[PDB]
Write a protein that holds these residues in place. Structure first.
Motif, mmCIF file in Angstrom:
data_model
loop_
_atom_site.group_PDB
_atom_site.id
_atom_site.type_symbol
_atom_site.label_atom_id
_atom_site.label_comp_id
_atom_site.label_asym_id
_atom_site.label_seq_id
_atom_site.Cartn_x
_atom_site.Cartn_y
_atom_site.Cartn_z
ATOM 1 N N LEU A 1 0.871 -1.172 0.000
ATOM 2 C CA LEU A 1 0.000 0.000 0.000
ATOM 3 C C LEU A 1 0.914 1.230 0.000
ATOM 4 N N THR B 1 -2.254 8.474 3.221
ATOM 5 C CA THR B 1 -2.396 8.397 4.698
ATOM 6 C C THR B 1 -1.995 7.005 5.253
ATOM 7 N N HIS B 2 -1.911 5.975 4.415
ATOM 8 C CA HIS B 2 -1.604 4.587 4.845
ATOM 9 C C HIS B 2 -0.522 4.045 3.929
ATOM 10 N N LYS B 3 0.574 3.576 4.505
ATOM 11 C CA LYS B 3 1.654 2.876 3.784
ATOM 12 C C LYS B 3 1.795 1.516 4.487
ATOM 13 N N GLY B 4 2.285 0.540 3.756
ATOM 14 C CA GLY B 4 2.771 -0.683 4.368
ATOM 15 C C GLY B 4 2.571 -1.872 3.475
ATOM 16 N N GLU B 5 2.560 -3.035 4.116
ATOM 17 C CA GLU B 5 2.650 -4.359 3.449
ATOM 18 C C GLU B 5 1.774 -5.329 4.232
ATOM 19 N N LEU B 6 0.937 -6.080 3.551
ATOM 20 C CA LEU B 6 0.093 -7.151 4.109
ATOM 21 C C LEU B 6 0.354 -8.424 3.338
ATOM 22 N N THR B 7 0.375 -9.551 4.026
ATOM 23 C CA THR B 7 0.516 -10.847 3.364
ATOM 24 C C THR B 7 -0.635 -11.734 3.726
ATOM 25 N N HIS C 1 -9.342 -5.215 1.783
ATOM 26 C CA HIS C 1 -8.470 -4.475 2.734
ATOM 27 C C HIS C 1 -8.091 -3.057 2.247
ATOM 28 N N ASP D 1 -10.956 -0.939 3.014
ATOM 29 C CA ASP D 1 -11.009 -0.787 4.488
ATOM 30 C C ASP D 1 -10.006 0.272 4.944
ATOM 31 N N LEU D 2 -8.822 0.311 4.356
ATOM 32 C CA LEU D 2 -7.755 1.219 4.839
ATOM 33 C C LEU D 2 -7.811 2.559 4.130
#
Ligand SMILES: [Cl-]
Ligand SMILES: [Cl-]
Ligand SMILES: [Cl-]
Ligand SMILES: [Cl-]
Ligand SMILES: [Cl-]
Ligand SMILES: [Cl-]
Ligand SMILES: [Zn+2]
Ligand SMILES: [Zn+2]
Ligand SMILES: [Zn+2]
Ligand SMILES: [Zn+2]
Lengths: 56, 56
Positions: free
Chosen positions: B7, B11-17, B33, B36-37
């Motif tokens: 992502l 306003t939202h950064k990161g990593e989902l697995t 997701h 959702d984010l």
């Protein structure tokens, strides 16, 4: 400051970051996302690294 | 296989697995997701690394 959420869930793992003016603002933001991602676990916070962990 | 969502939101950064039996299963999971984010952006997929990116 930039806070991080580490999700160690059974079905969802990963890391989210967000900018917040205080730690309570970030934690409320993150509790909403953990709910959204179906991760219900034990919470810890590390102030030195501005990192919340939620562990299933 | 384990798929990843990167992502890169404002306003939202990161990593989902997540583990999924096929890529469509993971992508439907991830689109839920990202919604959702609050991350609405351009999607790319890299099959070699089973990685979806959503960029605002
Ligand atoms: Cl800052
Ligand atoms: Cl996930
Ligand atoms: Cl999920
Ligand atoms: Cl597998
Ligand atoms: Cl975030
Ligand atoms: Cl958010
Ligand atoms: Zn700040
Ligand atoms: Zn997930
Ligand atoms: Zn698999
Ligand atoms: Zn967020």
């Amino acid at each position: 400051m930039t806070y991080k959420l580490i999700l160690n869930g059974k079905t969802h793992k990963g890391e989210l970051t967000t900018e917040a003016v205080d730690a309570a603002t970030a934690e409320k933001h993150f509790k909403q996302h953990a709910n959204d991602l179906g991760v219900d676990g034990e919470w810890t916070y590390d102030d030195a690294t501005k990192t919340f962990t939620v562990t299933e």
